[PDB]
Amino acid sequence: AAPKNRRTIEVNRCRRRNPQKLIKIKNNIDICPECGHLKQKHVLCGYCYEKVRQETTKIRQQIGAQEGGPFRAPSVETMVLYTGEKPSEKDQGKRIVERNIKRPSWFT
Amino acid sequence: ISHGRVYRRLGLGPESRIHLLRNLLTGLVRHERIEATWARADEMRGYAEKLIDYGKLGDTNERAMRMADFWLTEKDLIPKLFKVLAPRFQGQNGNYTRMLQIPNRKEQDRAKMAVIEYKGNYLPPLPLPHRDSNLTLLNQLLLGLQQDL
Amino acid sequence: VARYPPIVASMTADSKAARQRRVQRWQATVHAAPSVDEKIRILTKMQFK
RNA sequence: AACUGU
RNA sequence: UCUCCAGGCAUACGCGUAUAACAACUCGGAUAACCAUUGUUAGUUAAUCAGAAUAGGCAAUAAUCACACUAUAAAUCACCUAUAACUUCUCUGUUAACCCAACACCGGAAUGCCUAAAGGAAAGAUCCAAAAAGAUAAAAGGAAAAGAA
Numbered sequence: 001a002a003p004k005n006r007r008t009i010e011v012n013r014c015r016r017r018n019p020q021k022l023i024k025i026k027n028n029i030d031i032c033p034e035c036g037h038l039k040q041k042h043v044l045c046g047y048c049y050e051k052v053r054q055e056t057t058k059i060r061q062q063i064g065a066q067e068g069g070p071f072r073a074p075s076v077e078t079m080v081l082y083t084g085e086k087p088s089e090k091d092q093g094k095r096i097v098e099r100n101i102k103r104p105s106w107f108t
Numbered sequence: 109i110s111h112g113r114v115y116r117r118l119g120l121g122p123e124s125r126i127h128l129l130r131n132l133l134t135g136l137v138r139h140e141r142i143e144a145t146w147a148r149a150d151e152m153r154g155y156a157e158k159l160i161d162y163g164k165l166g167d168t169n170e171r172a173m174r175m176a177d178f179w180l181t182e183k184d185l186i187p188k189l190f191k192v193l194a195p196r197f198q199g200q201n202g203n204y205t206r207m208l209q210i211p212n213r214k215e216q217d218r219a220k221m222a223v224i225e226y227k228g229n230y231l232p233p234l235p236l237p238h239r240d241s242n243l244t245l246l247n248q249l250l251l252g253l254q255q256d257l
Numbered sequence: 258v259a260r261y262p263p264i265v266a267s268m269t270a271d272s273k274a275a276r277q278r279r280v281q282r283w284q285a286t287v288h289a290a291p292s293v294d295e296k297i298r299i300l301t302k303m304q305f306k
Numbered sequence: 307a308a309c310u311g312u
Numbered sequence: 313u314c315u316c317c318a319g320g321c322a323u324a325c326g327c328g329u330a331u332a333a334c335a336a337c338u339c340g341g342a343u344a345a346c347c348a349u350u351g352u353u354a355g356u357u358a359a360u361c362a363g364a365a366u367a368g369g370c371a372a373u374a375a376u377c378a379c380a381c382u383a384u385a386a387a388u389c390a391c392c393u394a395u396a397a398c399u400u401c402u403c404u405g406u407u408a409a410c411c412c413a414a415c416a417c418c419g420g421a422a423u424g425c426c427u428a429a430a431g432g433a434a435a436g437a438u439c440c441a442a443a444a445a446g447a448u449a450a451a452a453g454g455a456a457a458a459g460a461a
């Protein structure tokens with residue numbers, strides 16, 4: 001079955017310009033205090049998350065080199081230490097990861 | 109028609125879902141923080157919490173050893189669960205896993221993204237939300253009400 | 258008294274370590290070839306450039 | 307005839 | 313690294329640079345990632361692999377592990393006699409995920425070895441509508457198992 005006649009632009013225009021078919025505005029936009037960038041109320045910041053995710057790779061890269069092989073996951077707890085920080089007695093008996101950078105302000 | 113459903117349909121079948129969940133659980137244990145789709149992350153959150161209980165049960169438990177071996181493909185992790193994860197969560201009675209929403213992937217599919225991590229980990233803290241301080245005008249007004257009461 | 262599983266690569270995985278484990282399984286069969294001629298046959302039954 | 311949601 | 317799949321490798325034929333590196337992100341891939349796209353530069357190595365004198369004389373009896381043994385469809389130049397020449401290694405083929413089907417077509421495509429050590433990925437996301445298709449399961453009964461004519 002094919003259309004019996006051409007559909008008029010006016011009829012077509014009304015269909016596409018009906019409110020149901022139009023793009024709706026969003027009121028859930030929020031600001032990120034940490035980075036000062038926009039975010040949604042139910043969505044986290046990304047500018048700061050970029051630092052966190054990349055820092056994780058840098059920390060993970062250090063971990064990968066230290067292990068040196070697959071299936072080498074330690075059976076003991078692990079800790080990350082940055083330059084200017086010295087291991088404590090409580091840190092004994094735990095895998096220690098050394099980071100050349102200083103302790104990040106956000107990281108505690 | 110998803111009324112009363114308590115299980116998500118993932119993978120190519122129920123076995124694939126277990127294997128896909130098994131792979132996700134193994135990866136999470138190794139790294140302690142993994143980013144995945146929100147639907148899949150929610151489904152696997154319950155499994156991770158129960159796994160910590162199995163570690164708490166004890167190494168000598170035959171069921172735990174069988175459970176740990178099946179769920180963890182990489183066998184180096186089996187000592188870790190009983191000697192790293194289980195000792196860490198001994199004080200905790202639950203809520204071992206923290207799941208939060210991440211901005212959706214800009215990969216042309218706009219999948220809902222979430223991050224699931226084990227609490228008490230050595231990884232850098234996630235950017236968690238901070239509640240409003242009591243110094244705010246509304247809270248201070250409520251503080252005055254509290255003092256009167 | 259915990260029967261910890263061996264820390265080895267999974268046989269069915271698609272990786273270098275898994276491939277080596279699969280290679281060892283065949284190499285065990287070669288070690289299990291009694292006759293010298295069978296050893297030669299197994300080693301030479303496939304033609305390669 | 308059996309067989310099975312025919 | 314993990315999960316799972318199980319025709320792979322050589323030659324022929326055909327194709328003719330689709331090969332490889334770099335740089336691009338417009339066009340091409342029926343979307344991206346990435347390139348198979350665009351531009352530039354590079355490539356395939358052979359005395360061993362492959363392709364590119366004359367005149368006379370004379371021939372009964374297959375193979376089949378060829379012996380026995382039979383059979384019927386009836387199944388192999390040589391070597392002698394003369395003549396002629398008289399010290400040689402160049403040329404060409406060699407790449408590729410490739411061909412015939414208007415297409416990056418669920419089609420067609422010879423031989424040898426071997427059957428996973430080789431070769432691979434069904435999941436763009438979310439929802440779990442109805443209806444429809446495919447698959448699995450059936451209380452009691454058995455046309456409302458593999459047995460006979």
Ligand SMILES: [Zn+2]
Pocket residue numbers: 032033034035036037045046047048049
């Ligand atoms: Zn921020």
